[PDB]
């Protein structure tokens, strides 16, 4: 550990169940004053898939979106939200923090599950 211990973010809830077509939301509370970190939203598969992130990535085309990440006023907790949830949106979700150095180092939270009924 030359650099310095940097403790990972968190997720909630462990199991979130929303009806289909409805809106689901997870809360990631991550705090670091030092340096520059970017938050990322993920869902896995039989294997990272990047859904949203904050600051909001505008780099790739594809206009609107379902998945979005936004910081809450207290400036610690963040809102991870899928809107208009399908049936196949179910799966293992998670969040992670990422630094801005070229050799950037990433740490992820403890994965949570989402369920879509109906």
């Amino acid at each position: 550990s030359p650099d310095r211990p940097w403790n990972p973010p968190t997720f909630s809830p462990a199991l979130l169940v929303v009806t289909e077509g409805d809106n689901a939301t997870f809360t990631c509370s991550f705090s670091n004053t030092s340096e520059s970190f970017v938050l990322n939203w993920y869902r896995m598969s039989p294997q990272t898939d990047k859904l949203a992130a904050f600051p909001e990535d505008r780099s790739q085309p594809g206009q609107d979106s379902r998945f979005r990440v936004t910081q809450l006023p207290n400036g610690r907790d963040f809102h991870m939200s899928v809107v208009r949830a399908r049936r196949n949106d179910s799966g293992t979700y998670l969040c992670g923090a990422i630094s801005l150095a070229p050799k950037a180092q990433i740490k992820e939270s403890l994965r949570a599950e989402l369920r879509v009924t109906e």
Partner: antibody, heavy 112, light 108 residues
Framework: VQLVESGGGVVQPGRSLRLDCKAS????????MHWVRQAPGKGLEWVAV????????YYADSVKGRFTISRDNSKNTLFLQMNSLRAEDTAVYYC??????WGQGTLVTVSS | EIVLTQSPATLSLSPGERATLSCRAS??????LAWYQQKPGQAPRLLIY???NRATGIPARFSGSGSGTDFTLTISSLEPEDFAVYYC?????????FGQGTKVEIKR
């Protein structure tokens, strides 16, 4: 968002010299630091490393007992003490964080 | 010290051509190998760390592979900017050791 080095140039053999590397627009105090030189016209060679707090430090065999690497986290300055310099120690010394932010490089020429 | 051998010495290509550079270790560093870019009169530029992971703000055409002993940096569509000298580096243990470097040369 930089690392500016200092304390270079020409020095006779056996005479000491001391490099200074002052980082900016980052968090220096929490990153680890490195020293990498390169002889002119030849490839890079790792020199020394210091853990961010200073709990531990490792050197290159070529520089043991001679060079000394340290850091003053207050002033956000990396220090390199180069003693008993030999003509072979001629090189360009860059400082870099472990996360790989590198500076311009400082030139040290050892000749009599 | 671990001995990293880079092959070839020089590589003569043109813009758009594939570029594959090899690095062989006297030992095993696992995935702790890194790759740097250097143009004349400049500082080293990180490209690929941990043999797969690409550095931030680094073009997608740049990539890497290999594990254990042998590793390969790759440039898919070469670009006039990419002509430079390339060194690898191992973070496995101490002392951190670079290679002699491979030079990517303009082919005419």
């Amino acid at each position: 968002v930089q690392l500016v080095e200092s304390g270079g140039g020409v020095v006779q053999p056996g005479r000491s010299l001391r490099l200074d590397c002052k980082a900016s627009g980052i968090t220096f105090s929490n990153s680890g630091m490195h020293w990498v030189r390169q002889a002119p016209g030849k490839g890079l060679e790792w020199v020394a490393v210091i853990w961010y707090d200073g709990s531990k430090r490792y050197y290159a065999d070529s520089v043991k007992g001679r060079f000394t690497i340290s850091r003053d986290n207050s002033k956000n300055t990396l220090f390199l003490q180069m003693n008993s310099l030999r003509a072979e120690d001629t090189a360009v010394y860059y400082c870099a964080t472990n996360d790989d932010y590198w500076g311009q490089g400082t030139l040290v020429t050892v000749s009599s | 010290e671990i001995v990293l051998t880079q092959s070839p010495a020089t590589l003569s290509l043109s813009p758009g051509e594939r570029a594959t550079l090899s690095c062989r270790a006297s030992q095993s560093v696992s995935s702790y190998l890194a790759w740097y870019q250097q143009k004349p009169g400049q500082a080293p530029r990180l490209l690929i760390y941990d043999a797969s992971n690409r550095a931030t703000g680094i073009p997608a055409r740049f990539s890497g592979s290999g594990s254990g002993t042998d590793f390969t940096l790759t440039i898919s569509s070469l670009e006039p900017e990419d002509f430079a000298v390339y060194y690898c580096q191992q973070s496995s243990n101490w002392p951190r050791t670079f290679g002699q470097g491979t030079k990517v040369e303009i082919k005419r």
